[PDB]
Design a protein around this ligand. Structure first.
Ligand SMILES: OCCOCCOCCOCCOCCOCCOCCOCCOCCOCCOCCOCCOCCO
Ligand SMILES: Cc1cc2nc3c(=O)[nH]c(=O)nc-3n(C[C@H](O)[C@H](O)[C@H](O)COP(=O)(O)O)c2cc1C
Length: 374
């Protein structure tokens, strides 16, 4: 296929084919505004905000104040997973007992009586008249992206009628075809290497092919060429992309742009713990993919506690996402407070985090290093 770079730059009014990945709990408004100012596209993780439309608007307005204008060259990102299933009282209760014991072994008092739901899914917005949909249509960000699946097509179509470009993470060719059939404007091809949660549509799918970002891009682009598909969405690659070499290799597939998460995590505009940062500076451990933290497969740097949590948790025993994240977050908090701290924390990062420290904490320097040849 022909290179999509120029079309992407013109459509989004940007200089460089670079998207800073939305990262719940790690990216900030400041990081996003800075990357948009530098000439890429900043992103705001709003996955928890589907029924909090005031927060959507406030955050966007604070971003506009940081950028200096209301151009809204931004990606607003939401979660569209399946909601946790009813009928799971047995599994859920056993998971609480599990955590009771974890607290006991940590020597932390345990109070928790139920796994609470941290946030709903955008998939539960079935009505195009819902206030969140009306709001996004009014706000007109350049992009609204979805992770974990798609909301109903009536909702997609309504957002598109306001000029917003809609993106979805895909992890395999069948997911790409789903996105094509639903007339998405963009797909983010997420490799197995990617840090944070994997955006496969079936949670923890046992048959996931685990394609590396290069392999996924090659598969998708070959399908487009071979089958003669004439109007493909923008193709964005994400997962393990850490330097100008990595970028160029993927751009040679004639895709639109790259989306990078982990490389920003050392910036002083990101919010990671001193222990997480130390891991970038002196990498000792590999990463691993686990569903035992949140209920859905995510990639983190490996630690003794996270390996324990992972191996102790047969898939059939893990409550649906995001129910285990409530137990995990409450532990990490309770640990932090009662003065144990980060042995119990997560360290989200992709499998090239060990090549991602560039001896700077400056977003601008990191950005310059990435875009040198563009
Ligand atoms: O067009 C780029 C310059 O914009 C200057 C003023 O334009 C105002 C009106 O624009 C409205 C529509 O614009 C849509 C296109 O916007 C493209 C992105 O522009 C974002 C604003 O850029 C301001 C200049 O930033 C300079 C580089 O700063 C890098 C460090 O930022 C500090 C971060 O905090
Ligand atoms: C700390 C962290 C948090 C993340 N949170 C989200 C999120 O809130 N929404 C989302 O769509 N993707 C999220 N992701 C995934 C990124 O969109 C992207 O797929 C990933 O960063 C790409 O791989 P890389 O980290 O190796 O660059 C997150 C990734 C990381 C590392």
């Amino acid at each position: 296929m022909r290179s999509q770079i120029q079309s992407f730059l013109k459509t989004f009014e940007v200089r460089y084919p670079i998207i800073q990945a939305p990262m719940a709990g790690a990216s900030t408004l400041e990081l996003a505004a800075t990357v948009t100012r530098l000439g890429g596209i900043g992103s705001i993780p709003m996955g928890s905000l589907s029924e909090k439309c005031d927060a959507i608007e406030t955050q966007l307005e604070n971003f506009d104040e940081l950028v200096g204008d209301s151009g809204r060259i931004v990606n607003l990102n939401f979660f569209a997973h399946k909601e946790p299933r009813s009928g799971r009282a047995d599994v859920n209760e056993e998971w609480l007992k599990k955590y009771d014991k974890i607290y006991g072994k940590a020597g932390i008092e345990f109070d928790k009586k139920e796994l609470k739901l941290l946030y709903p899914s955008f998939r539960s917005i079935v009505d195009p008249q819902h206030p969140t949909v009306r709001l996004l249509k009014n706000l007109k960000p350049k992009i609204v992206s979805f992770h974990f699946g798609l909301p109903h097509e009536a909702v997609i179509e309504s957002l598109q009628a306001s000029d917003i470009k809609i993106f979805v993470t895909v992890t395999n060719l069948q997911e790409f075809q789903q996105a094509y059939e639903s007339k998405l404007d963009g797909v983010v091809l997420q490799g197995w290497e990617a840090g944070g949660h994997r955006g496969n549509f079936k949670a923890n799918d046992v048959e996931d092919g685990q394609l590396k970002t290069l392999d996924l891009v090659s598969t998708i682009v070959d399908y487009i060429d071979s089958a003669s598909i004439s109007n493909p969405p923008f193709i964005i690659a994400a997962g393990g992309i850490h330097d100008d070499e990595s970028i160029k290799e993927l751009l040679q597939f004639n895709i639109a742009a790259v989306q990078l998460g982990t490389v920003w995590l050392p910036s002083s505009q990101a919010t990671i713990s001193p222990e997480h940062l130390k891991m970038f500076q002196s990498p000792k451990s590999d990463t691993m993919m686990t569903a035992a933290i949140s209920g859905r497969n995510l990639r983190t740097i490996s630690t003794p506690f996270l390996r324990d949590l992972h191996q102790s948790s047969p898939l059939a025993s893990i409550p649906d996402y995001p129910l285990p994240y409530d137990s995990f977050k409450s532990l990490a908090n309770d640990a932090k407070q009662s003065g144990k701290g980060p042995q119990y924390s997560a360290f989200l990062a992709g499998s090239n985090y060990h090549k991602s420290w560039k001896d700077t904490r400056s977003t601008e320097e990191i950005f310059s290093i990435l875009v040198q040849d563009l």
